[PDB]
């Protein structure tokens, strides 16, 4: 894995995290994602906040066409939590997540590790039925939220590519499953 690929990787990570801070609702192209998506960098080197290998491995129950979809659905909702925390107007209720919610039950809690991703955003205080930002913390940490959101987006993107039979490393990745 070369010097140029490693440098491109980090430049992309910083550029896209900055873009998410600047305008958290914008869509990103595959071209923008390329330096993070078609690189020869190992998994442990590409995901620095999420343990992406564990998120997949722990949920690798039954048929990949199904569990990759289940993970994608959870990641979509987790990516909206991060984009909303970065938005010039955060939704009301942004400070807390309630587990007793029908969408939450069928999405984020349909995968092992879903709640821990919310913790990485800053929802670190345990509550009777959910998680919240601690009272002493006034605002989200934009750098932390943006890097987590980008990794959630990237992993959703890779899983979507595998489901579309179009991942740059589709064959090697399918053998692993």
UniProtKB/Swiss-Prot annotation:
Autoubiquitinated. Interaction with OTULIN is required to suppress formation of 'Met-1'-linked polyubiquitin chains and prevent subsequent inactivation of the LUBAC complex. Changing residue 101 to A: Abolished interaction with SPATA2. Changing residue 84 to A: Reduced interaction with OTULIN. It comes from the Eukaryota. Expressed in both normal and transformed breast epithelial cell lines. It is linked to Immunodeficiency 115 with autoinflammation: An autosomal recessive immunologic disorder manifesting in early infancy and characterized by combined immunodeficiency, recurrent bacterial, viral, and fungal infections, as well as autoinflammatory features, including arthritis and dermatitis. The PUB domain mediates interaction with the PIM motifs of VCP and RNF31, with a strong preference for RNF31. Component of the LUBAC complex (linear ubiquitin chain assembly complex) which consists of SHARPIN, RBCK1 and RNF31. LUBAC has a MW of approximately 600 kDa suggesting a heteromultimeric assembly of its subunits. Associates with the TNF-R1 signaling complex (TNF-RSC) in a stimulation-dependent manner. Interacts (via the PUB domain) with OTULIN (via the PIM motif); the interaction is direct. Interacts (via the PUB domain) with VCP (via the PIM motif). Interacts (via the PUB domain) with SPATA2 (via the PIM motif); interaction is direct and bridges RNF31 and CYLD. (Microbial infection) Interacts with S.flexneri E3 ubiquitin-protein ligases IpaH1.4 and IpaH2.5, leading to its ubiquitination. E3 ubiquitin-protein ligase component of the LUBAC complex which conjugates linear ('Met-1'-linked) polyubiquitin chains to substrates and plays a key role in NF-kappa-B activation and regulation of inflammation. LUBAC conjugates linear polyubiquitin to IKBKG and RIPK1 and is involved in activation of the canonical NF-kappa-B and the JNK signaling pathways. Linear ubiquitination mediated by the LUBAC complex interferes with TNF-induced cell death and thereby prevents inflammation. This is E3 ubiquitin-protein ligase RNF31. It comes from Homo sapiens.
């Amino acid at each position: 894995p070369g010097e140029e690929e490693e440098r491109a990787f980090l430049v992309a990570r910083e550029e896209l995290a900055s873009a998410l801070r600047r305008d958290s609702g914008q869509a990103f192209s595959l071209e923008q994602l390329r330096p993070l998506l078609a690189s020869s960098l190992p998994l442990a080197a590409r995901y620095l906040q999420l343990d992406a290998a564990r998120l997949v491995r722990c949920n690798a129950h039954g048929e990949p066409r199904n569990y990759l979809n289940t993970l994608s659905t959870a990641l979509n909702i987790l990516e909206k939590y991060g984009r909303n925390l970065l938005s010039p107007q955060r939704p009301r209720y942004w400070r807390g997540v309630k587990f007793n919610n029908p969408v939450f039950r069928s999405t984020v809690d349909a995968v092992q590790g879903g709640r821990d991703v919310l913790r990485l955003y800053g929802y670190t205080e345990e509550q009777p039925d959910g998680l919240s930002f601690p009272e002493g913390q006034e605002e989200p940490d934009e750098h932390q939220v943006a890097t987590v959101t980008l990794e959630v987006l990237l992993l959703r993107t890779e899983l979507s590519l595998l489901l579309q039979n179009t991942h740059p490393r589709q064959q090697a990745l399918e053998q692993l499953l």
